[PDB]
C-alpha cells in the first residue's frame, strides 16, 4: 500500500536511497550485461577488468570512450529528478537524503542530486596509473586519438592506438597513463566509501531500493544492516514478487517513484 509508505515518508528524517541499473536503463543507458548487451564482439565482463586493460588499453578505452559519448544524448529520467528535488526540498526542512548508487553515468549529478556516493566510480573521472590522482573529466573526446572512435558495430576495425597517445596524466613530471575511475571485475570497493555508507545507513530511518533489489549485490551488503534495526525498506523495480508476499512497487521507476516522493 502506497499511503502506508507515505506515512513513513512523512516521518522520516534521514533517508537513504540505493540505486541500481534499472534507473540508468530507463534513461536509455546500456549496461552491456546479458541478452543483446554486446559491444562489438564483447560484453562488459570481457573488457571491464585490469587484465583486459593491461593487455589492450586501446580497446578498453575505445569501449569506455563510447560510453562517455553516448551520455551526451541520454538524460536523467523522472526518477532521477524526483529524487534530486526531494533531497533539496527535505534539506530545506533539515531532513537528509543520500544516494548510494552502483551506476557510473553521473545521471544523479545531472539531475541535481548532491549527497551521492558512487561506489563503482564514474565514467567521467580518471585515475593515473602512475600517480593515482583522480580528476574529473568530461572532455569530448577525452583525447584527440580517440576522436570518432569506439564505434559499437560488431565489425568495426580496432583503433589500435599507441599507449603514449591514450589519455595521459597532466602533472608534467608524471605523464602516466590514465584509466577510467571505475571499479572493474576483480577489484575491491574503496573502503573509505564503504565506511561512509555504513555510517549513513546506520543513521537512516527509511531506505529505498531503486532499479535493483535488496536480495542482490550490492543492495545486499547493506539492507541487512538497516532492516535488522527495524527500519522500513521500499523497493521500486520491475521484478515480480509471489502471490503470498518492507514494500514493493513493481513498475518503471520513472512512473512509480515521483508520486511516491511528492
Amino acid at each position: 500500500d502506497l499511503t502506508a509508505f507515505r506515512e513513513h515518508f512523512a516521518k522520516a528524517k534521514h533517508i537513504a536511497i540505493i540505486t541500481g541499473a534499472g534507473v540508468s536503463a530507463e534513461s536509455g543507458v546500456p549496461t552491456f550485461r546479458g541478452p543483446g548487451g554486446f559491444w562489438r564482439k564483447w560484453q562488459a565482463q570481457d573488457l571491464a577488468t585490469p587484465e583486459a586493460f593491461s593487455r589492450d588499453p586501446s580497446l578498453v578505452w575505445e569501449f569506455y570512450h563510447y560510453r562517455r559519448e553516448v551520455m551526451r544524448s541520454k538524460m536523467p529520467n523522472p526518477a532521477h529528478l524526483a529524487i534530486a528535488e526531494c533531497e533539496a526540498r527535505l534539506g530545506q526542512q533539515g531532513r537528509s537524503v543520500v544516494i548510494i548508487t552502483q551506476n557510473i553515468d553521473e545521471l544523479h549529478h545531472r539531475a541535481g542530486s548532491k549527497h551521492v556516493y558512487e561506489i563503482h566510480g564514474s565514467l567521467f573521472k580518471t585515475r593515473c596509473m602512475s600517480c593515482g590522482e583522480v580528476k574529473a573529466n568530461h572532455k569530448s573526446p577525452i583525447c584527440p586519438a580517440l576522436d570518432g572512435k569506439g564505434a559499437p558495430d560488431p565489425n568495426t576495425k580496432e583503433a589500435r592506438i599507441p599507449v603514449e597517445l591514450l589519455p595521459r596524466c597532466e602533472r608534467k613530471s608524471c605523464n602516466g597513463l590514465l584509466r577510467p575511475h571505475v571499479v572493474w571485475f576483480g577489484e575491491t570497493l574503496d573502503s573509505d566509501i564503504l565506511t561512509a555508507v555504513e555510517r549513513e545507513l546506520e543513521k537512516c530511518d527509511l531506505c529505498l531500493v531503486v532499479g535493483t533489489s535488496s536480495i542482490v549485490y550490492p543492495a545486499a551488503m547493506f539492507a541487512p544492516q538497516v532492516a535488522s534495526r527495524g527500519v522500513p525498506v521500499a523497493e521500486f523495480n520491475m521484478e515480480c514478487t509471489p502471490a503470498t508476499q518492507k514494500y514493493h512497487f513493481e513498475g518503471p521507476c520513472g512512473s512509480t517513484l515521483p508520486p511516491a516522493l511528492e
Partner: peptide, 8 residues
C-alpha cells in the same frame, strides 16, 4: 576489500 559482484 569487497569484490564487486562478490567476485561471482
Amino acid at each position: 576489500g569487497v569484490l564487486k559482484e562478490y567476485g561471482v
